[PDB]
Design an enzyme around this catalytic site. Structure first.
Site, PDB file in Angstrom:
ATOM      1  N   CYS A 159      19.316 -15.898  -3.254  1.00 33.17           N
ATOM      2  CA  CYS A 159      18.021 -15.557  -2.682  1.00 33.17           C
ATOM      3  C   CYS A 159      18.121 -14.608  -1.492  1.00 33.17           C
ATOM      4  CB  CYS A 159      17.231 -16.817  -2.337  1.00 33.17           C
ATOM      5  SG  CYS A 159      16.763 -17.770  -3.806  1.00 33.17           S
ATOM      6  N   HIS A 180      21.837 -20.608  -7.575  1.00 38.04           N
ATOM      7  CA  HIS A 180      20.585 -20.952  -6.915  1.00 38.04           C
ATOM      8  C   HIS A 180      20.118 -22.394  -7.178  1.00 38.04           C
ATOM      9  CE1 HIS A 180      16.451 -21.086  -5.612  1.00 38.04           C
ATOM     10  NE2 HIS A 180      16.186 -21.548  -6.824  1.00 38.04           N
ATOM     11  N   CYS A 232      20.098 -19.801  -0.134  1.00 42.38           N
ATOM     12  CA  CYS A 232      21.286 -19.512  -0.934  1.00 42.38           C
ATOM     13  C   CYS A 232      21.632 -18.024  -0.997  1.00 42.38           C
ATOM     14  CB  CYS A 232      21.174 -20.117  -2.345  1.00 42.38           C
ATOM     15  SG  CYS A 232      20.474 -19.077  -3.661  1.00 42.38           S
ATOM     16  N   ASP A 252      23.296 -37.809 -10.057  1.00 43.29           N
ATOM     17  CA  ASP A 252      23.897 -36.727 -10.847  1.00 43.29           C
ATOM     18  C   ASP A 252      22.942 -36.389 -11.980  1.00 43.29           C
ATOM     19  OD1 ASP A 252      24.941 -39.173 -12.692  1.00 43.29           O
ATOM     20  OD2 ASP A 252      25.007 -37.303 -13.847  1.00 43.29           O
ATOM     21  N   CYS A 255      14.487 -20.416   0.228  1.00 47.58           N
ATOM     22  CA  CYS A 255      15.847 -20.820  -0.122  1.00 47.58           C
ATOM     23  C   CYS A 255      16.916 -20.047   0.651  1.00 47.58           C
ATOM     24  CB  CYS A 255      16.075 -20.674  -1.629  1.00 47.58           C
ATOM     25  SG  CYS A 255      17.736 -21.136  -2.180  1.00 47.58           S
ATOM     26  N   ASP A 284      32.715 -40.144 -14.649  1.00 46.55           N
ATOM     27  CA  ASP A 284      32.050 -41.141 -15.473  1.00 46.55           C
ATOM     28  C   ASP A 284      33.069 -41.857 -16.376  1.00 46.55           C
ATOM     29  OD1 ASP A 284      32.426 -39.459 -17.697  1.00 46.55           O
ATOM     30  OD2 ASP A 284      30.478 -38.492 -17.378  1.00 46.55           O
TER      31      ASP A 284
HETATM   32 ZN   LIG Z   1      18.188 -19.601  -3.831  1.00 47.99          ZN
END
Ligand SMILES: [Zn+2]
Ligand SMILES: [Cl-]
Ligand SMILES: [Cl-]
Ligand SMILES: [Cl-]
Ligand SMILES: [Cl-]
Ligand SMILES: [Zn+2]
Lengths: 373, 373
Positions: B313, B339, B310, B270, B308, B92
């Site tokens: 998870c 996560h 990830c 963002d 999820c 930025d």
């Molecule tokens: Zn997750």
């Protein structure tokens, strides 16, 4: 694997190296056991702790009984499942942190009642309740519940507390044995007391050996006595313990204290020092500790330590970590902690290798010359 | 790879999906760009951020110019080398955080002088200095320096600030082009202003297109106007921008705001929301956000989200994360943040896939019905 088998593979003077085989895994000795339940600064995933080389971690009964609670952990499948660490866990008895952290205490022959430092709720520990809590957590190495001896201690108070601790060691042994699942799957360590007094240390060792434990801790050290005195006490205390069982020095400690304690027959160590050091900016190196917050590191592109094999030293500069710690970033604490725990594991590996090769005395000399240069 | 090439592979109504090819890597659009320089709560290694699916991260010029300083970063090899992220970085301009975070400011046609919120030291930003700082950092996508328009704004103030911003856009363009290394290796985005006023938005778009940029941001939104109004402004504002360049909605945002903005032609996003949310206990799920601190999660063994993909998870329970966050543990913030950032990337992937397959409208409907059920 067996419930518990300690095997000594090599010796050099009083130093030993070997393995403890347990159902959840093998522990290489001399071992450093990082704390897995450190207040506020727990900053590593279990996979990362394992990657540093740790074979076993320590859990704090006092913290866990307050949050999330022992019964809750049992309902959720035990501490291993709860926190995601599938290898051995040693739990302390809770007794020391009651004395050091709780707001008010009432001590007696039965145990101790205390108020939580978190919310002033009332709680209790005793040999039986401590063993029960460690069962609910499902730990693999259970510590007998003892009574702390402050430093310094008069001969009379050291004797009284040692004697009570030995009565409590028998109560701990009986409580452990009366729980089938615990007796068949976990191990129990007793704790030698007696302050700095050789005669009391001897009485304590004799009492513990008569009861019989899977391992023996030297308790009551690293409470402000200084290295010279600690080493003097270890000189006579460790040989009093059964030679064929592990010897655990609770709460030690600094790298040089660990080396000297191995020279005196110690097999196992725990200390919050490497984990606490991280967020505060202290990094261990083979050339001694540094404080990464120091302005001299602001443009230093070298890793924390020149030889360290850890992932932090493979990737990260002193300058970046300096910035992160100065800026109060979580990542700074993560990186410092990973390195410090890894450094300790590399120290233990070098100790193990040197004993196996009959060059530990030389290693200790070379280590000290460089570390304190 | 080229310096910059935006290619649109598929469209559905106003929505587009494609790629931005740059020297340091390819960015899949619509893209979410996690903040890589978040104050205090930076809690992920670059490898972890990459593992979540991020193709590009955002750096804050304001924070970096204060600590560790732009000249220092350049001396240390640039921001990529300093922080260990080798893929594209968008920076930025610093202007917004000056207005939102600095203690005192003096604004003029030349730029702004301000006092650090850290130590009250004096600093300066201008179109030329902002472009210079982004050069010293070595960012791949450089944002033109503009003047913020508070919400709400009168027509006169919106016009004045938009006009100044367009003068500053030309100054930014010229400063960027005058630096050979920057002009040949980085890209420059302009920022549309004009508040909620269609005529001012049009004048701003026309001015920016006349100057010519590699991409166009819609500035001045997500400053308290609410979704209905934000969507109304996007409805007329995005089509004013060149169709063949990326459209970047700065500071957005919540998952439903992202979906609706993609429906209106936005390619890049963002927001600190997923990273800030973590330590505060908010986890995003396909069934809406939850607050993991809530007592209802204390014995919940399910992962944060049922679908999820990830690493959190795959391994961690709600109950454990609840405990960690309640106990103030660093690891709790680490897990929540990993996560949340991963969830956002999975959202963007589902958006991309649905546009490619001509079923984004249906996805948006199904997403909302479940998320707000
Ligand atoms: Zn997750
Ligand atoms: Cl005393
Ligand atoms: Cl700094
Ligand atoms: Cl106004
Ligand atoms: Cl809790
Ligand atoms: Zn290291």
């Amino acid at each position: 694997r067996p419930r518990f088998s300690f095997s000594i593979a090599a010796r050099e003077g009083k130093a030993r190296t070997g393995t403890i085989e347990m159902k959840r895994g093998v522990i290489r000795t001399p071992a450093f056991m990082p704390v897995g339940t450190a207040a506020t600064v727990k900053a590593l995933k279990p996979e990362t702790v394992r990657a540093t080389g740790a074979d076993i971690i320590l859990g704090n009964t006092y913290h866990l009984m307050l949050r999330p609670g022992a019964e809750r952990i049992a309902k959720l499948g035990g501490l291993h499942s709860f926190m995601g660490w599938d290898r051995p866990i040693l739990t302390d008895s809770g007794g020391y942190q009651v004395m050091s952290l709780s707001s008010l205490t009432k001590q007696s022959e039965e145990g101790v009642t205390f108020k939580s430092h978190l919310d002033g709720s009332r709680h209790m520990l005793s040999p039986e309740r401590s063993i029960e809590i460690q069962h609910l957590l499902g730990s693999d190495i259970v510590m007998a519940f003892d009574e702390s001896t402050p430093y310094p201690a008069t001969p009379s108070r050291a004797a009284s507390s040692m004697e009570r601790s030995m009565r409590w060691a028998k109560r701990s042994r009986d409580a452990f044995d009366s729980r089938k699942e615990q007796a068949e799957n976990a191990a129990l360590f007793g704790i030698q007391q007696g302050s700095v007094f050789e005669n009391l240390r001897q009485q304590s060792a004799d009492a513990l050996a008569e009861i019989g434990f899977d391992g023996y801790a030297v308790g009551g050290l690293a409470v402000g006595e200084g290295q010279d005195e600690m080493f003097r006490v270890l000189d006579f205390s460790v040989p009093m313990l059964p030679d064929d069982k592990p010897h655990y020095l609770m709460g030690v400690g600094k790298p040089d204290d660990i080396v000297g304690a191995v020279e005196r027959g110690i097999d196992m160590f725990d200390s919050v020092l490497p984990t606490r050091s991280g967020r505060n900016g202290q990094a261990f190196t083979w050339d001694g500790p540094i404080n990464i917050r120091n302005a001299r590191f602001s443009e230093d592109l070298k890793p924390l330590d020149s030889e360290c094999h850890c992932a932090v030293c493979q990737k990260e500069s002193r300058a970046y970590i300096h910035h992160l710690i100065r800026a109060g970033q979580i990542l700074g604490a993560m990186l410092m902690t990973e390195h410090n725990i890894a450094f300790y594991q590399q120290l233990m590996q070098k100790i193990r290798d040197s004993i196996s090769e009959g060059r530990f005395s030389q290693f200790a000399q070379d280590f000290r010359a460089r570390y304190f240069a």
